[PDB]
Each structure stands twice: as C-alpha cells, then as structure tokens.
Amino acid sequence: QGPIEIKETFKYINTVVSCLVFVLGIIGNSTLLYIIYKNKCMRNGPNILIASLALGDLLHIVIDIPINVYKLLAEDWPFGAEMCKLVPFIQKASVGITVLSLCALSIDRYRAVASWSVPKWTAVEIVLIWVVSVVLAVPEAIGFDIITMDYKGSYLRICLLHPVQKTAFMQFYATAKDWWLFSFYFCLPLAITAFFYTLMTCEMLRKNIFEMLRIDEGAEKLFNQDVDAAVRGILRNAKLKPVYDSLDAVRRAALINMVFQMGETGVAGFTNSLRMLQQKRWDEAAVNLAKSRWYNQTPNRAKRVITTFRTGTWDAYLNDHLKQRREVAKTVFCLVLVFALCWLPLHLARILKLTLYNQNDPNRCELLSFLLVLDYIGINMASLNSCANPIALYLVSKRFKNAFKSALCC
Ligand SMILES: Cc1cc(C)cc(C(=O)N(C)[C@H](Cc2ccc(-c3ccccc3)cc2)C(=O)N[C@@H](Cc2c[nH]c3ccccc23)C(=O)O)c1
Ligand SMILES: CCCCCCCC/C=C\CCCCCCCC(=O)OC[C@H](O)CO
Ligand SMILES: CCCCCCCC/C=C\CCCCCCCC(=O)OC[C@H](O)CO
Ligand SMILES: CCCCCCCC/C=C\CCCCCCCC(=O)OC[C@H](O)CO
Ligand SMILES: CCCCCCCC/C=C\CCCCCCCC(=O)OC[C@H](O)CO
Ligand SMILES: CCCCCCCC/C=C\CCCCCCCC(=O)OC[C@H](O)CO
C-alpha cells in the first residue's frame, strides 16, 4: 500500500538527508561561529544575530538529529522520558530562535535606512530572542511523555503529546498546536520580514535617488518633494509616461535625473532614445544617448545616467556607505528567503492535512499518499534549513565567502 511503501522509501531518504544535515550543519555552523568570533571586522549587529541563529541551529543538530534518525527507523523509543521532553523542546526553541532572529534581522535593516535615525539594542534582541523562543517551547517539554504498551509478550514505547491533556492550558495547547506552529513559526516571520523588506527597499530607493541628485545636481532638503513632483509630471506627459512605466525603479530615477536637469520637454526630445529604452534595448539606448548635445555639454553626468540606464543598478551613484548597506540587506533577506522556501513544503503539507481531511476512505487513500510524500519532503527541507545558512552566506556575501575561505581553505 502507498503508506507503507512511502514510509519505507523515506526511511532511506531521510536517513541520508539527516546524516548530510548533521555533517554539513556541524561543520558549517561551527565555522560560522568561528569566523564571527575570530574576525573582529565581522562583529556587527546583523552578524551577531546570525551567530546566535547558527548556535540555535547547532543545538538542534547535535541534540535532535541523531535521535530523530533512529526514531524514524525504529518503532520503539529507547531514549527515555527525559530525551523526549527535550527533543521537541529543542526543536521548537531552535526554530523559534531562527524565526525571531530573522524578524530582528529584517527590522534592523529597516531601522538602518530609516529616516528617523543601538549597540546595546542587539544585546537586548539576543536576550529576547532566546528567552521568548525557550518560553514558547516549554509546552513541548510539558505535554510530551512516554506511553508504554504491553500486550501478549510485546512491549512498545512511544513518545507522544496526547490530544487529551491534564490542565486546561495544556489541553488548549495540544489542540491549537498545529495552527499555532503554522501561524507563529511561518506566517509571523514571513509577514514581518516581507513588511519590513518592502518598507526598506522603498526607503533605500529614496536614499539612492537623493544621493544620485546630490552627486549630479550638487544643501537642499526639498529633494524628496521635488522628486515626487517630478514623477507626477512625468506621469502627466504622454511622451514620458509610457517609457517611465516600462522602466524599473532604478532606471526611473535616471529618467527623473534627466527631468531635473532639462525639464520634461527637453527629456521628451529623446524620442528615439526613449523608444529604445521602452524596448529594453539598454546598450542601444546608451549609445544613442552618448552621441547627444546633452552628453556634449555635461559628459560626466551623462556618463553616469547612461551607465545607470544600461546597468540598472546604482553603481555610478552609490557611495561606499550605501554599497555596504545593500550587500548586508541582500544577505539578510537571502536567509529570510531561504527560510521561507525550506519551511514552505512542510507547513503546506500540515495545513492541507489540517484542512482537507474529510475521512472518506475513497478520497483519503490517494490524498494521504500525496500529503505523506509532501510531509516527508517537508521535514527534509526543514532539516536542510538548519544547515543552509552557512552555505547561503558563502554564496550571497562576499565578506562571508572570504571569511570562510580564510578559516577553512588556508
Ligand atoms: C516550527 C515547526 C513547525 C513544524 C510543522 C515542525 C517543526 C519540527 O519540529 N520539525 C520539522 C522537526 C525536525 C526539525 C526541527 C527543527 C529544524 C530547524 C531548527 C533550526 C533552524 C532550522 C530548522 C529542522 C528540522 C520534526 O521532525 N518534527 C516531527 C516531530 C518529532 C521529531 N522528532 C521528535 C522527537 C520527539 C517528539 C516529537 C518529534 C514532526 O513534526 O513530524 C517545527
Ligand atoms: C553569540 C551570541 C550569543 C548566543 C547565545 C545566547 C544565549 C545563551 C543562553 C543559553 C544557551 C545555552 C547553550 C550554551 C551556549 C553558550 C553561549 C555563551 O556562553 O555565550 C556567552 C557570551 O556570548 C560569550 O562571550
Ligand atoms: C517579542 C515577543 C513575542 C511574544 C509572542 C507570544 C505570542 C503568543 C504567546 C502567548 C499566547 C498565549 C495564549 C494563551 C491561551 C491559553 C488558553 C487558556 O489560558 O485556557 C484557560 C486556562 O484555564 C488558563 O490556565
Ligand atoms: C506580540 C505579538 C506577536 C504575535 C502573536 C500572535 C501570533 C499568532 C498567535 C496565534 C494565532 C494562532 C493561534 C491558533 C489558534 C487555533 C484555535 C484552535 O484551537 O483551532 C482548532 C481547530 O478546530 C483545528 O482545525
Ligand atoms: C533553497 C532556498 C534558495 C533561496 C535562494 C535565495 C536567493 C535570494 C538572494 C538574494 C535576493 C533577496 C530577495 C529578498 C526578497 C524578500 C524576501 C521576503 O521578504 O520574503 C517574504 C515571504 O516570501 C512572504 O511572501
Ligand atoms: C544542502 C544545503 C541547502 C541549501 C542550498 C543553498 C541555499 C541557498 C543558496 C543560494 C542562495 C542564493 C545565492 C546566490 C546569490 C547570487 C547573487 C550573488 O552571489 O552576489 C554576491 C556575490 O558575492 C557577488 O558579489
């Protein structure tokens, strides 16, 4: 049958995945804690939050993974009542540390670019993350216990959190647990990190346009309302509106740059160049713009604007301080994205089972086999997330990649 065939297959798959996560995660997160400790240049707010997150994932890896490997392979629980109050507690405490750290990471990225304006603040965050994650994981250590069954010369030890619990709170917890796990440990971080991501990019966008105009125009705080009025007029002009809509945020700022210098009527005169921008022919747009009277009178500014068009980034206008903040923000929301994709299949599987289990035998069989396969994939991706950040940091962050190579290769 599907259920017995599927569980046997994933006995092999999960054992290899969990052995991979154990080895990769022990090496990766230990090295991650090493490079943040040894490299004094690496000690900053976001990195220290990444360190606690790596310590939390290391705790789950060394405490829970070897047991979870055996648990999957044997029907009996031999590790005692203590280990099975501990393993689910560590599992929810560690994931909670990741969940709250990721939220603190995304809020810190917003505050970094925030218009309103702190080393002690990261220390308060660290305490709050671990205290709150551990408190919210305590009901796991409360509800879970061993059930021993003996019938006809055969005994079995299962550790479970029974749907029926002693106290009112533990009863409510056991019943609400599945939705609680979905809400706080998936919906809460994804919503908060997305909310502060979008606010951050908007604020980073204004800071970049402001910096661009500061370099090109050359002490005016009216730049922001001036920009807003400028895009209003660009949306007013039938010659400038179509190309402006086609452009991304960065190239729209390059168009605004030309509008600041020449006005809307002057920018409209580049009908051929504007068309080619709308066609997304950046290099052709760069060349035709380069052979212009605007280029001739102001080549330095023309060079930067046409490079901004062609490139689509802020390279020509971004200072060292702002290039630092974009790489850090890119690192933070890479980990956020990695968390979402790793925890998406499992939370999807649990919610589909929670919502679509009609208990009719005909519909159940095929839906069960699919949901079971999805659940197994889900817990594999979640295990991978506990070892994925060292690899992710290596690939997405030039600083982390160099720190890893210094610590490991030579
Ligand atoms: C928030 C949350 C939500 C859901 C739906 C499941 C888990 C969970 O707890 N899982 C997915 C573990 C395995 C695991 C735990 C933590 C990480 C982790 C930690 C830090 C950073 C990133 C990832 C990765 C995998 C799991 O296998 N849970 C089992 C229950 C279970 C496994 N071993 C046990 C021992 C005793 C009692 C229960 C268990 C299940 O949900 O099916 C956690
Ligand atoms: C690196 C950021 C700090 C992350 C950890 C904060 C929470 C520690 C409390 C319980 C953990 C129990 C497991 C033991 C781990 C020991 C961690 C530790 O001793 O760190 C003290 C201090 O940061 C060294 O200078
Ligand atoms: C940064 C900080 C983030 C912290 C985020 C935490 C949010 C969820 C925490 C607690 C909700 C608890 C809900 C409690 C409902 C229990 C039901 C109940 O109390 O049952 C009655 C019983 O008689 C009484 O003991
Ligand atoms: C500072 C604030 C931080 C954020 C704090 C709030 C985060 C989300 C908390 C609770 C929502 C999920 C609670 C789950 C309640 C489920 C109710 C229930 O028992 O439903 C059983 C249902 O019948 C089975 O299908
Ligand atoms: C296996 C995982 C592979 C993952 C590969 C990741 C590569 C991304 C790197 C940099 C782009 C950063 C983009 C950040 C986008 C914002 C993330 C976010 O806010 O997530 C909200 C959540 O999706 C609710 O909708
Ligand atoms: C088995 C392990 C499970 C995890 C598997 C991998 C998880 C995340 C991997 C990649 C995320 C995106 C990395 C690629 C980002 C592309 C942009 C980039 O690399 O730019 C920075 C670079 O240093 C130039 O300066």
Numbering used by the authors: 91 to 207, 214 to 303, 1002 to 1111, 311 to 403
The authors write:
Endothelin-1 (ET-1) activates the both ETRs with sub-nanomolar affinities. The activation of the ETA receptor leads to potent and long-lasting vasoconstriction, whereas that of the ETB receptor induces nitric oxide-mediated vasorelaxation. IRL2500 is a peptide-mimetic ETR antagonist developed based on the partial region of ET-119, not on bosentan.
To facilitate crystallization, we replaced the third intracellular loop (ICL3) of the receptor with minimal T4 Lysozyme25 (ETB-Y4-mT4L). The overall structure consists of the canonical 7 transmembrane helices (TM), the amphipathic helix 8 at the C-terminus (H8), and two antiparallel β-strands in the extracellular loop 2 (ECL2), as in the previously determined ETB structures. The IRL2500-bound structure is similar to the bosentan-bound structure, rather than the ET-1-bound structure (R.M.S.D. values for Cα atoms = 1.34 and 1.95 Å, respectively), reflecting the inactive conformation. IRL2500 binds to the transmembrane binding cleft exposed to the extracellular side, with a clear electron density. The carboxylate group of the tryptophan moiety in IRL2500 forms salt bridges with R3436.55 (superscripts indicate Ballesteros–Weinstein numbers). The tryptophan side chain of IRL2500 forms a hydrogen bond with the carbonyl group of the N1582.61 side chain and a cation–π interaction with the K1612.64 side chain, The tryptophan also forms extensive van der Waals interactions with V1773.28, P1783.29, and F2404.64. The biphenyl group penetrates deeply into the receptor core proximal to D1472.50, and forms van der Waals interactions with D1472.50, H1502.53, W3366.48, and S3767.43. Moreover, the dimethylbenzoyl and biphenyl groups of IRL2500 sandwich the W3366.48 side chain, tightly preventing its inward rotation.
